[PDB]
DNA sequence: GGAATTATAATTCC
DNA sequence: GGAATTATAATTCC
């Protein structure tokens, strides 16, 4: 269990870090049989970060503006995971910062379409876009994002119930043989 | 006018004849705008025969067990379409004739799927299946029809009142059996 | 999980 | 209306 439910090869990082929380979900089960999760956002004086959080018990602390200091968290590829084995500590004063305003903007600003599709495939890709279509299969769902200079299609093969201006947590993207697309992956989500 | 309405390069048949009707479809709508049509199983002595009928003043003379003539009807690949220019008549008893058991038991008889692929691409397909399979897509509804022991897939490219078959069409790579312009779907 | 394979639907040309 | 083309979904292999 010191692993647990963490993506494989991610870094382990014992050194404690302070952070203030910018954003939480509500928790929601990724999986069939496996306790629930969900995404935050963070940041620290020198920039921001995107974490899946899959110990409830710890939802009550990620909480807008609050500050905390995480102990023994996960890095996988620049996103933080945090399981049972990570310490989370309330902030104490001395160690408490003003995060620059341009991060928190940065954290808030959704990457453009046009940009998404020549980063690395796999890479993961979270963000509020406009919506075209939606499609309706047996085993997917289909949507076309855009932006004002590009678009792309999103695949969801995961469950089709509270599927109905969007944001995207966690995707996928996939540059295959074809054209580019977003696919729905272990924590993908979907707030409206 | 004449030939309207009828299949292309069906033959033409002044000479008249007396058949008896076997079985008849509710009239339906298989194309918009135009009339409606319905499906019918007529027979004579030496074949039985199925007809597509698009003269819906005709509807009454088609009742189950009546004898009828019928004069200028045409022949599509041995199909028989009938439309306003062909003359249909109650037939007098002396014609009245009496159709074998035998060909009553082929007009009935669903051929098999096996011999089905087997026939000609284009030949027209008339028979009661069963289905285990049936898949909604936006633009087409494709069932599974089989028997003990082949099957074969259908595709319906029409409007989806849909919970026997008349007239689809036998098509390459896998065959099929595809909805056409009088497809016609009974429970 | 992603790409490549196969299955399948819809479009198009004759 | 049928077949071949292309678009699309699903399956499979690494």
């Not at 940041?43 to 921001?48: L, P, V």
Request: charge should be positive; avoid cysteine; charged fraction near 30%.
């Amino acid at each position: 269990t010191p692993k647990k439910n963490i993506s494989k090869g991610a870094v382990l990082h014992e050194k404690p870090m302070t952070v203030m929380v910018l954003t939480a979900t509500e928790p929601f089960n990724y999986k069939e049989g496996k306790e629930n999760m969900f995404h935050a956002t963070v940041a620290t004086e020198s920039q921001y970060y995107r974490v899946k959080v899959f110990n409830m018990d710890l939802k009550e602390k990620f909480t807008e503006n609050k500050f905390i200091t995480i102990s023994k968290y996960f890095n996988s590829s620049g996103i933080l995971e945090i399981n049972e084995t990570a310490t989370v500590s309330e902030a104490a004063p001395n160690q408490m910062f003003e995060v620059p305003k341009n991060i928190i903007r940065s954290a808030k600003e959704t990457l453009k379409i046009s940009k998404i599709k020549e980063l690395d495939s796999g890479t993961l890709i979270y963000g509020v876009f406009a919506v075209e279509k939606k499609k309706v299969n047996d085993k997917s769902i289909t949507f076309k994002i855009k932006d004002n200079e590009d678009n792309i299609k999103v695949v969801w093969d995961k469950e089709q119930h509270n599927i109905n201006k969007l944001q995207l947590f966690s995707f996928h993207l996939r540059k295959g043989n074809g054209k580019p697309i977003l696919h729905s992956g272990n924590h993908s989500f979907i707030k409206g």
